[PDB]
From Swiss-Prot:
Catalytic subunit of a constitutively active serine/threonine-protein kinase complex that phosphorylates a large number of substrates containing acidic residues C-terminal to the phosphorylated serine or threonine. Phosphorylates YTA7 during S-phase to promote transcription of histones. ATP binds at residues 44-52, 67. Signal peptide: none annotated. This is Casein kinase II subunit alpha. The gene is CKA1. The keyword Cell division does not apply. It comes from Saccharomyces cerevisiae (strain ATCC 204508 / S288c).
Amino acid sequence: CRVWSEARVYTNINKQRTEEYWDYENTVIDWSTNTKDYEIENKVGRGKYSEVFQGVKLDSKVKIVIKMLKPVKKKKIKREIKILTDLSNEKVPPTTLPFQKDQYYTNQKEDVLKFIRPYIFDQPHNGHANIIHLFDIIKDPISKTPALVFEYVDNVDFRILYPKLTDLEIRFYMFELLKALDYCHSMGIMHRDVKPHNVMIDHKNKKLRLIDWGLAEFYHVNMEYNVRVASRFFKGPELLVDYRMYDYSLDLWSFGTMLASMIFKREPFFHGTSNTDQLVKIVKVLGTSDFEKYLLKYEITLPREFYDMDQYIRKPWHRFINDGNKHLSGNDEIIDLIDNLLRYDHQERLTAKEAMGHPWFAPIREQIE
C-alpha cells in the first residue's frame, strides 16, 4: 500500500481490547467428544470446508445444526471459533449502550469527516441477537472429525424467498442485517463474506441470522489483509484492485450489492465471468472517471492481470428500473441509498448506522418504539 487508510468508525476496538480477545493463534480448542450429546440427522447444506447437518441436542431435545469440518485449515478454524465466541459471549453488547458520537467517528482526518452523513440511526439496538449462536465445539466419537454446533434456523433459500417479499419486508430485513453488521463492526470484526447465502431468514418468525463466520477477521489499524476473501459477485473494488488496507466498509459494499440485486431483480447484480471481469462489470456501471479518481487517491497500481481500463460512461441507476422491479425500485430513496453504498472509495460508503438512519428506512424506524 502506498497510501494508508483506517476505518472511519470503530477504528481502535482492538487497541481497547487485548490479546485475550483477538489473538486466535494462541488459543487451544477444547473439542468435546460427542459420545452422547448430539444426534445427527439429515443434511441441510454444504460449505466450502464443511458438510452441515440438522440434528438434536439429546439432553434438551433442541433442534441444532452440526457443521462437520473437512480435514485442515486449523488456524482458520481457530479464528472462526474465536470470532463466534467473542460475538456471543459479550455480556453487554456495545450496540445496546447509549450512542457516543466521539467514540463512534474515531478517524479524525479532515478528509474523512466530510463523509459523515447528516442522518444516522443513533439508538441502542439488538443486532447482537442477529448473529448466529455457536453452542458447542465437538469431535465425532468414532471418526474424530471436528465439528461446530449452532443454533438452527428454519431458512428458505433466497432464490425462493426473496421474490415473495414486499417492499416493506425487504426494508425490514435489510435493517436487521444492518443491525448485525453494526454490532460485529462495534466488536472490531469484519465479516468479509456478506451475501444472501450467508443470511438465514425464517420468514414466519421475522427472524434473520448472519452465518458463515469462516472468512471473518479482526480489524487492526493499518493491517494489510488478504484480498482473496468474499465471493466473486460480492467482492468490493478494494479486493479486486488488491488494496489490502481495507476495513469494515467492505461489508457495506457487499450489503449494497445484495440490496441492489433485491431491488432491481438482477441476481447477481455484478456478474463477472472471472475475477478480472468482475471489476470490468463494476466499472461499466460506476464509470471510468470515478474509477481513475479512486486509483489516484490511493496510488493504486493494478494487479498484473489487468490491462485497460477502457472508457465507460457511468450508467445511472434509473437505467436498471423495468416493469418487473418498479414496485421496489421506483422511489428516490432506494436509489440514493444504493448510490451511497456502492462507491469505489471505501471511505465514501455509508457506515451501518448511517445507512440505518437513511430515509428509505423511516417506515421501519417509525415502528420500533
